[model samples]
Target: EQPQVELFVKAGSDGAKIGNCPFSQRLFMVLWLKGVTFNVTTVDTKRRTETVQKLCPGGQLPFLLYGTEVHTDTNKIMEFLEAVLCPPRYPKLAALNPESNTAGLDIFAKFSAYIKNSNPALNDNLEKGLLKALKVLDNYLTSPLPEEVEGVSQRKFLDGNELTLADCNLLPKLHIVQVVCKKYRGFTIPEAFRGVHRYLSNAYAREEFASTCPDDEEIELAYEQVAKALK
Candidate 1:
């Protein structure tokens, strides 16, 4: 009805940035996937509570106000979105529930948060830590899903051929790694990692994947702020 749907997101230092935030972008991606309409508002992170508190007491960004009812956090917002898009935003896909595979998400989050949290780049632990986590993800993507069940598509994507919320949760972080490595370390996703590269080629090729993705330059500028320490 357009009666609802206001999104309060972080006002970036770059000013009027909508795509820079991984978590915020996740919800935006979901909103796009579901074809849900929304408006973007901003919060000064320095005084996050200034206007944010009026909606969500936690004063968090990427919060969605749905008809006076507010939603905070990407996970919860996505769940709410799913309920709203019960047509449902690629119903065949979302119904599969691949986001349950946070085992993989955690791996990328470890890498992403490592990039975000580490100082002036990475120490040996974080460097190895990211590589180690990527190794795990590589292994996971390489392995099959225990001989599969009845309805699953059985090829491409983390869950299947279709894009799921898990992919929505994941690919941006992978893009971050790709951008950070390229800019700082002169590193790119190596062709040697057969499993990960195959998945990358497949997933990164899709329109949905490409549409939500930020530019490499944007990603590099967004990251590498804390840790330009590339390999």
Candidate 2:
């Protein structure tokens, strides 16, 4: 049988992998970190709304198909993978749920605004939202947490070195912020936000981020391509 796992993502108009999609990237990272082998599928930008809705009622891309089961959203896929692969390590996954954890509450909305709305009139508003959302994360990552008796490696992830869903979910969006914000808006990481800088430095060095996120050139070209098509 073909691998039970298939990830569907958005494809650019020209059909190259212009899918720097953060949700897709996160799910991909989780699968890799858990040593779960899978393959990727793409939906055309033109047909994404319809195709994704059919896959999952939410009309969101990056849904996963594991065997006969279909899962929608990053959290669902992460939960399932964590349950089967590493249950003990993710006890705090319940807390990271954005409904409860404000740290990740606005992540998707904030990043999507950057991609979908770029009116010069709204520039300051957009920048404000992005910075506010980013700072929430910068502070939360280093917040003290319950000690894990199993012991953890801070080098392993943002959560005192334990590879939690937070890292899986946060890294992809941050990479997008790092690339898209700079190329389109001339915004760079402020020297004042040392925590964000250090976290990014450590996160980007992960081999999975390197493999999943588009490289510098790919991000630039794809952002340009996506913007042109949206217009």
Candidate 3:
């Protein structure tokens, strides 16, 4: 039998629906990719109630409860899940490569830096930083894998044909960039970046990504507040 797993993540205005936290959605992708049955709880981090405080001390989102063990921190939670559920431990589940975790690692920071920039003097520089990160990601995705690489036969996703930990982390942040950037900055992922474009299509085609994707409205609303806060 599988272990009882529960994930507590940041919630939107409704306090029940998933919020715009990319970190939370990353774990969602991981769970769905592994076909793990898990319960989800949404906590409004902005207005933590007494119950919420007790349930999630320290107030960080995307914590995982694996039986009696409570795991916090996004990357650490992922590591724990992989340890408990992936091959050797649970060979029935597909393996998610820890090697792939570094793919596009700087993307999240670059993206935030660009999106959060309000100074016209620095806008172009921040945009360049984000674009440079995207280009690196594109190269990683499209580059041919070594024949000696174990497990995967194809090089479709960040690591391989299978959805890996890299995809779980990168895709959610990409989704945020796709929505918020397009709406606010009139920016788009360059169509010429075929590797990235193809990756998005491949991820979107899967229910794991599609079903867990929050509404564009939710994303827009969430970031709109972020943008407003700078004014």
What TM-score would every model get versus the actual structure?
0.74, 0.69, 0.86
Candidate 3 residue 170 C-alpha distance from true site, Å? 0.9
Model 3 has an lDDT value of 0.78
Give lDDT tens digits, candidate 2, residues 42-100. 77656554645666666567788887678886777778877765544424433432422
Whole-model alpha-carbon lDDT for candidate 1: 0.66
Write candidate 3's Cα lDDT for 148-181 as tens digits: 3333233668766777777888889899988988
> Residue 58 CA error for candidate 3 (Å)?
2.5
TM-score ranking, best first:
3, 1, 2
- In Å, residue 98's CA in model 2 sits off its true spot by 8.7
Q: In model 2, which regions exceed 4 Å deviation?
A: 1-3, 12-14, 43-60, 86-108, 111-122, 148-156, 217-231
Q: lDDT for model 2, on a 0 to 1 scale?
A: 0.66
- Candidate with better lDDT, 1 vs 2: 1
lDDT of 1 by residue, 124-185 (tens): 56657777777777766666664354332336767766667777787777777777766665
- Candidate 3's displacement at residue 146, Å, is 1.0
Residue 211 of model 2 has an lDDT of 73
